[PDB]
Write a protein that binds this ligand. Structure first.
Ligand SMILES: Nc1nc2c(ncn2[C@@H]2O[C@H](COP(=O)(O)O[C@H]3[C@@H](O)[C@H](n4ccc(=O)[nH]c4=O)O[C@@H]3CO)[C@H]3CC(O)(O)C[C@H]32)c(=O)[nH]1
Ligand code: NA
Length: 396
């Protein structure tokens, strides 16, 4: 019996059920969420959370949009910072501390990101950082150190690619991969509060990827996740969400490494994109539903729940207390990758929290990166188009 079967049963015998719409399609993240919910439901007296899978995160936002039109929101959902900004336009969200959920010791990297007009509207739950995944076997084979700088990263990819006869830096042509290169070549999306997609650092970042493809050291992955493509051709590195850890581990036929991101200099690791989601609570939910939300959120923020979630998935523990939990400690003592993910979570950048950001990152920025990388569109012309489309979307 799967944990979602156990939850369906707990929920059947409950007098209040708080629905939690999420965007986990399976693997470790879906299992860890459900296991956490099973445990919460068991300590309650007929008060339950029902996790409802809505597809991926994009399917999730579309389902929540539909929910607003219909006037039937769930009690909780996962949200990106930009989803929070959008739901706040609708005034759809309960201030988190109005529930009496205590947030002291939540990492300010995550807590800052859920604060709008000084008010916290989300609980950091499943927060990821990009890390460098690598093939320790293939690097040892050719005597190539883990690269510490972007310069060493490009040299390693070129040297390994020539040795193995194939592009060893694997990347998705998407906003998430672009963010790593953009941020770490000095880029910033907002200039005096205006969204700029076509700055010289944008052009430089997209050019580096496109030159990578031409020169034969960067391999665009067009079909499924990087971890879904492992096994065809030599692989040295990717830059990818920490929540892909269990996916990399299950798929890898080689000894998997995790490192901090290459930076401009050895003085500091590069910045990683913060991804995954916060839990929000909808004004429309009943007093009783909101009360279960309140208890669920205190449970999810407990050191044990965060320790178990983070060690099962590769997400970043969102609390100082999680790091002092002995379950976390015992995982970290036998697996240094958990410390690597925490170390990398210190060098952490967000995309803009604009209501329209979801549409822009996929259908505009995402497209322009695909045009340059897959159709050999001029990097600057592809981003000049993106800038034009985003300004049309954002205008007035
Ligand atoms: N809607 C919307 N999505 C957004 C936004 N910002 C970023 N993202 C997407 O967040 C994903 C990273 O979030 P994360 O929770 O760190 O990782 C996910 C999965 O990515 C990852 N996974 C799943 C299957 C698999 O084979 N491998 C694997 O690594 O496991 C986790 C649960 O699904 C990226 C994925 C993307 O959709 O291509 C674009 C990115 C936004 O603002 N809105
Ligand atoms: Na999955």
């Amino acid at each position: 019996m799967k944990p979602e079967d156990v939850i369906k049963e707990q929920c059947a015998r409950a007098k209040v059920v708080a629905e939690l719409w999420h965007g986990f399609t399976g693997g470790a993240p879906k299992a860890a969420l459900e296991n956490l919910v099973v445990e919460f439901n068991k300590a309650q007296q007929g008060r339950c959370v029902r996790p409802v899978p809505q597809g991926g995160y994009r399917d999730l936002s579309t389902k929540i949009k539909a929910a607003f039109a219909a006037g039937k929101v769930p009690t909780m959902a996962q949200a990106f910072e930009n989803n929070i900004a959008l739901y706040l336009e609708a005034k759809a969200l309960l201030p988190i501390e109005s529930l009496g959920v205590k947030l002291q010791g939540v990492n300010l990297t995550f807590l800052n990101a859920v604060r709008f007009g000084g008010v916290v509207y989300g609980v950091p739950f499943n927060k990821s950082i990009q890390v460098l995944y690598y093939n320790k076997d293939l690097l040892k084979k050719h005597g190539v150190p883990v690269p510490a700088t972007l310069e060493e990263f490009v040299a390693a990819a070129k040297k390994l690619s020539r040795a193995e006869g194939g592009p060893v830096y694997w990347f998705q042509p998407d906003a998430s991969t672009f963010a790593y290169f953009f941020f770490n070549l000095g880029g910033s999306y907002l200039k005096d509060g205006k969204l700029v997609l076509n700055s010289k650092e944008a052009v430089e970042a997209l050019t580096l990827l496109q030159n990578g493809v031409k020169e034969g050291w960067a391999k665009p992955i067009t079909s499924g996740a990087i971890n879904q493509n492992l096994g065809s051709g030599p692989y040295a590195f990717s830059v990818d969400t920490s929540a892909g850890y269990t996916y990399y581990l299950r798929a890898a036929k080689f000894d998997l490494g995790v490192a901090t991101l290459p930076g401009r200099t050895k003085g500091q690791p590069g910045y990683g994109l913060v991804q995954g989601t916060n839990l929000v609570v909808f004004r429309q939910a009943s007093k009783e539903e909101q009360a279960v939300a309140k208890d669920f959120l205190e449970f999810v923020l407990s050191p044990r729940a965060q320790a178990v979630f983070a060690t099962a998935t590769g997400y970043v523990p969102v609390t100082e207390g999680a790091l002092k939990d002995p379950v976390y400690q015992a995982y970290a003592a036998e697996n240094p990758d958990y410390a690597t993910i925490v170390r990398q979570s210190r060098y952490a950048k967000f995309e803009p929290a604009l209501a329209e950001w979801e549409q822009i990152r996929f259908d505009i920025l995402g497209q322009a990166i695909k045009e340059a990388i897959l159709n050999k569109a001029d990097p600057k012309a592809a981003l000049d188009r993106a800038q034009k489309l985003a300004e049309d979307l954002l205008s007035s």
